[PDB]
Amino acid sequence: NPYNKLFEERIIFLGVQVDDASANDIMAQLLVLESLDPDRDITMYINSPGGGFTSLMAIYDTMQYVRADIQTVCLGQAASAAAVLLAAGTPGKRMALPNARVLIHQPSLSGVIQGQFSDLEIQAAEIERMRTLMETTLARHTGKDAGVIRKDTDRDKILTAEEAKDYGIIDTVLEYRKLS
Amino acid sequence: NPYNKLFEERIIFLGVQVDDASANDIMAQLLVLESLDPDRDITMYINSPGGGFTSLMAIYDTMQYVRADIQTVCLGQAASAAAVLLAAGTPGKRMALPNARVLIHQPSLSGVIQGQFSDLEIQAAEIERMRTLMETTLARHTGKDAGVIRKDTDRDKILTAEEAKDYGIIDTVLEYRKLS
Amino acid sequence: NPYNKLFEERIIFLGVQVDDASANDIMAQLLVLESLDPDRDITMYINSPGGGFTSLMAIYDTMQYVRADIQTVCLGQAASAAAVLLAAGTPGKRMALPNARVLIHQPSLSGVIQGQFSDLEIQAAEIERMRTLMETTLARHTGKDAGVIRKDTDRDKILTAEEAKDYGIIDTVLEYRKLS
Amino acid sequence: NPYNKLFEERIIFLGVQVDDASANDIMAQLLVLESLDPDRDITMYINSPGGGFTSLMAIYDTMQYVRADIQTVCLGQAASAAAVLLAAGTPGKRMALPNARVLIHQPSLSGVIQGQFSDLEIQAAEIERMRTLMETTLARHTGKDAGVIRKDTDRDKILTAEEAKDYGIIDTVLEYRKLS
Amino acid sequence: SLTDSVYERLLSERIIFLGSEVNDEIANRLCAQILLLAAEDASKDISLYINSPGGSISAGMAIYDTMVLAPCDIATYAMGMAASMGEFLLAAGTKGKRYALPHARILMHQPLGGVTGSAADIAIQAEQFAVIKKEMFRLNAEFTGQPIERIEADSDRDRWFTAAEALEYGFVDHIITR
Amino acid sequence: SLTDSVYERLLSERIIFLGSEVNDEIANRLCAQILLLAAEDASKDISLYINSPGGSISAGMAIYDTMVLAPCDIATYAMGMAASMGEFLLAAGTKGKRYALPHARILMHQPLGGVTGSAADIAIQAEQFAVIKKEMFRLNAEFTGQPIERIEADSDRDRWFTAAEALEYGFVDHIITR
Amino acid sequence: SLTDSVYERLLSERIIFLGSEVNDEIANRLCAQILLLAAEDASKDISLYINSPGGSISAGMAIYDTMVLAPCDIATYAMGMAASMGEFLLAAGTKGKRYALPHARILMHQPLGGVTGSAADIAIQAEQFAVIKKEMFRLNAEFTGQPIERIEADSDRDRWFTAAEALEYGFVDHIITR
Amino acid sequence: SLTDSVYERLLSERIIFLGSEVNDEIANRLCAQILLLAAEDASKDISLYINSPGGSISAGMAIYDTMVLAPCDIATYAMGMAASMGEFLLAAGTKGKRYALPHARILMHQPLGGVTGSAADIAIQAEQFAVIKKEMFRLNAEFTGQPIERIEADSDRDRWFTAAEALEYGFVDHIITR
Amino acid sequence: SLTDSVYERLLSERIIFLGSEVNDEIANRLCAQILLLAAEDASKDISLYINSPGGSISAGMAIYDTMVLAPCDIATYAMGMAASMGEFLLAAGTKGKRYALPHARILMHQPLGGVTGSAADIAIQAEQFAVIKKEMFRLNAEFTGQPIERIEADSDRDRWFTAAEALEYGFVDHIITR
Numbered sequence A, B, C, D: 001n002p003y004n005k006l007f008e009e010r011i012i013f014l015g016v017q018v019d020d021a022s023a024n025d026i027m028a029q030l031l032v033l034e035s036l037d038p039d040r041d042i043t044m045y046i047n048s049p050g051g052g053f054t055s056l057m058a059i060y061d062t063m064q065y066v067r068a069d070i071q072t073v074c075l076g077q078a079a080s081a082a083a084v085l086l087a088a089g090t091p092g093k094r095m096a097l098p099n100a101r102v103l104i105h106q107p108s109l110s111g112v113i114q115g116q117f118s119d120l121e122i123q124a125a126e127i128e129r130m131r132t133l134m135e136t137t138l139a140r141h142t143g144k145d146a147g148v149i150r151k152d153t154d155r156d157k158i159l160t161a162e163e164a165k166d167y168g169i170i171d172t173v174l175e176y177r178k179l180s
Numbered sequence E, F, G, H, I: 001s002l003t004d005s006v007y008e009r010l011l012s013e014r015i016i017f018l019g020s021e022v023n024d025e026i027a028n029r030l031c032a033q034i035l036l037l038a039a040e041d042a043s044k045d046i047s048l049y050i051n052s053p054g055g056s057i058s059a060g061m062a063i064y065d066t067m068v069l070a071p072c073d074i075a076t077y078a079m080g081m082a083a084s085m086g087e088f089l090l091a092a093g094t095k096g097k098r099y100a101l102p103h104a105r106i107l108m109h110q111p112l113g114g115v116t117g118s119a120a121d122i123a124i125q126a127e128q129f130a131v132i133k134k135e136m137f138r139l140n141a142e143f144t145g146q147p148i149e150r151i152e153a154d155s156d157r158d159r160w161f162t163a164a165e166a167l168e169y170g171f172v173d174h175i176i177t178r
Ligand SMILES: CC(C)C[C@H](NC(=O)[C@H](Cc1ccccc1)NC(=O)c1cnccn1)B(O)O
Pocket: A018, A019, A049, A050, A051, A052, A053, A054, A056, A079, A080, A081, A084, A104, A105, A106, A107, A108, A109, A110, A126, A127, A130, A134
């Protein structure tokens, strides 16, 4: 199996929709790699359309929590939660191949959530707290101010790898190191 | 298992719909084969109806990123994303058996995406960037100009193996090497 | 497992609907058997209702491409893609048990494909190219002229094993070799 | 596993609906048992509601084709294709336990098949050829004349084990060999 | 249709019915009936019998505005069930002419609804829901004569009233008894 | 039908209703009613009560053109809900004769829709959506008297107005009060 | 039905409506209305207000033939939306009597459809689609006065026109303005 | 209903419509209209405008028999689309009185259907389909004046005709032009 | 409804239609029409045009009993399709007054149905199906004048007849020709 073979090579794949199950798989892999060697850098390849904000914050907390550094390499697309996780890597070791996508926007609810107006007010304050927490994470990880993140992630802010490096989501664009 | 047996023989199969899961499987296989031997040519057999553009760019970035050369052999049909991945192989080692298909057209959205007119404008600019990036990739890989790719992939441009070799998608048509 | 046991005995089963997944499985098995021994004849047992034309041409290209000869033995039915793949075997080694069926007709679209009249014209020219390529393959493999194949596969041309041998789809009818 | 354990004991189970997949499984098992020992009798236990006629003829051709004799023991029901396959066993070694069912009728189409009247005429001639081939198989295997099979299988002819032995579908009724 | 026939025959007698969930279609039907009855005679009472399981606020807002802006005094009749927009439109009647049948059940609760879209869209929906709830509670305080804080504390969840309980609270002014 | 009966009876009194989502069918019904009322009397006002959750722009464009091209002065009445095409057709009324009921809720937001097809088709749909949005915003600026930049900045998302807020913005000219 | 009532009342005034997707049923209804209006008076204009999202060509062909062979001069009115068969039937009106309301949106694009059956059946459908597209483009060139090559190059994909753009292209002859 | 109203008004003028798929219900409606028009006046022409995508043969057989046995001369009018049973009933009209509108599309293909049941049932259905196809082809040869072998060779698959092509083949006798 | 209108207009002329599948509802409609026509005039013929794909026997039994017991002579007309209950009710007409249109297709086959429940219930259903089949075959032998054994041997499966074949068998007595 290639996933296990790269797991022995300290490589994690954030390759599916970011839900609680994929979040727990990524957290278990990160904790295993941290218990194995807490100094060697954990490589996280990110090709994901995102998902829930709680799974996003779980993976972010586990990436910042492990003693090993997280080299997040974005491939293809890091939308919604995967772009915040891509910026959540170790500063100076955040990579993305040149044709990868970075989609940053405010968190949204998957469908309609019904209830009384007090419960709707609570859910609205909670998604506003989610938006503020995502903006604070992107401000602390990209070097920008939270207000610039707030205007930019007001709608779908879509960037390339270079555009994400100028934005601060990644710290280096990875060249093609093919020998030919 | 024949897939694992050919994986020890440095052979990868792009044989399903190009979504994020198949993209991550192909990327994991490519990274394993690169970590095993970065000089031996990775053979990628391509029989796929394509899929998303982000998974397309992920597989393209990983194919160009690995130190091993990518001999892309198209079998049957390299449609949409699989034709761009077929052209994404190493120059001089892009193959296709004579009755294979190469379908190149502009990227489309799978269904209807709703939202406000600003979000629709953002999605339209994003799919225009996808079209321009696909045209630039095909221009840099087939030797043609991006405008010729733009007129040709305006609609479904369907080519045979010989027609793809004259077009530049492949560099060689593979003869039938049967001993009889 | 009987499939793997016969795979060590150089026997491949074309026993399901001919889609891209089954096509890639058959191609992987053929390439493994070619890499194992390129002189020993690959036996392909064919009991299939067919499927897509692109998977048909993929399996045909891989059967003609491998260095090993392809003894195609039709069991029960070889409709559509199967019958062309049955004729695609090595000349002189194409077999079918006496009560097998061979259904040859022009390729059809599975359902309705919508779009603008230019896209419909392109799809019509493509399915006409599919019909012409199937007729050319059957003419080069059965010894007949492409026009006779065109009139015969205009509708569902259904033949027995003897009728397929007189037609040229197979080169020998296999007798029942039971000892009693 | 009991199926594999009886497969080492030369026992095959025709226990599901006779479609192309079950047909190919039965053919693979028969070919493995023939390659193992072509003299030892292959026992085929038949408890099946039948299915397609092409899979029926595939299993019949493979049973007559293998060098080993086929002792078909009907349990519960040998209905439709399963009955013709029960009569398709080696003469003198066709068995059925006393409370088994044998349902013989003309082959039918599973649902409605649409198309032009020429295609419907072709499908009607094909199902008439199927009816004639089933009647010829039952006449050559049960000792009766094809016309008697034609009147009997005009509708659902349902027989017990004794009634199938007098009819000729089986050559022996198997007694209960319990020691008590 | 027999139901439409008896409805038009009671409309000729200035008796309208809020007999279903208050959606925009039934609301426009009721406002059209109110406008027709006001164009026929602007001095005779319009009897609105309400048997409704609730519905839309906008619809209820339209019915309420048509009730107040019609020169006729809208006599509302709580008939069996007045839940949500039913009780809001029942208490919206003319003071001294709001009635409850002696076994009607009146359900006053906070407006309900749904949030969707991006975070800014859900925040905008939050401002709109807060304004809607404040307007509905101020209007219910205007109708029942109760303080707005008691209205909001009682309609925080489902708050049930009988005929006498709604007469004591202020949704209706009399209990019809024979 | 009772609803169709009271609708035709108020159509005889030159009172039409935009009481559902503005699709092409309801739009053609409203334009037919407007053309009939203009053929009957071209000097009397046509009262259009709008309780609509929005709908199609084309439908709204058809209703708007029929409103302005009919010699009668179309008096619009915001009744409960005027969202999107409802507020666009409410503000489309004659100046000085656009009214809002005192508790109607008016929702102005950028036009919405979907993109489909190939990249060139979605680009063409992008040009068309940009032209549609610019035309709708210029028309709303013509109606409300506000600058087009304020219209676009406010209708970037869901923008809510009460009766007094819409009177201050310019969708309506008076607030009907008794 | 109120909608059918106002439709028949405007049919008595020789005003017909293409207010939905042009399928065979609505097409036969429109052709029956045209034949009735031609049997009543063959010298008075038939006003066809078109608010249609497109539909069937055979249906559009039937409506077009009924429009031409009708002794009456069919004055078409682009009302809000004229897409595909809507614009084809709008431009099919009498020259000098084709009008567009000042905010109607007109969508001209190559005919669409589907291919099914065997390869010979799909080839036959290809010949038929080519003949259909050539006939529609030649007819649009006859209507608008444009060359057929410009028609085919513009209607290769979705081609959008406003009122003034369609007046410049040739679908309509005047823009109704007050 | 407006559509039924204009249909009955044109039935009073002896103009019937085959405007949908020819199923047994629409067929019995058309035969009832033909029998009524023959009972009213047996010397005046019955105009049958056909815009049909095909349908059942039995239904087409019923309509055809009602057309012939009707004392009146059934003038058929190919209006837009005459496919399968539409073209069969169009060519079934009286000789010299079968017309095609100048842009109608006429499809003549072999009858289609379905087989089911046991092998004897499908064989019986095969005899019945062969007899049906031979009868339909002999009747089309009677109508168009073409040989039956040319009819069967042309209607083996979908065979398309314009107005002039159907006039040359023999489905219609004149092309209505103004 | 236009179809119901022409059906009632032909009912006034004593022409009824069996134009759908013979279920219990259509059967009771036909028996009510027969009873009404017998109450109006018991000496004039009732013309029953049958275009039916079959249906229920009970329903066919009800229609048949209403046909025979009505003092009027029920002239049946095979119109296009007479299958199962159609043919049974077509041959059920008065002797010398059963007609077939020259291209009607008549399908006589054994009654079909379904078994369900326990073994005793299915055995009871078997006795009932045997009695039903024997009664239907004896009645068809009474109608056509053929022996019951030939009826059962022919209707063992789908048995098809043209107009002349059904005239030779005995379902009808004349072939209407002009
Ligand atoms: C934008 C970044 C911060 C993350 C985004 N997350 C959300 O919008 C997700 C939506 C989602 C998508 C897929 C599956 C499940 C849930 N939002 C939430 O999980 C969420 C949960 N509670 C309140 C508010 N939002 B992403 O999916 O756009």
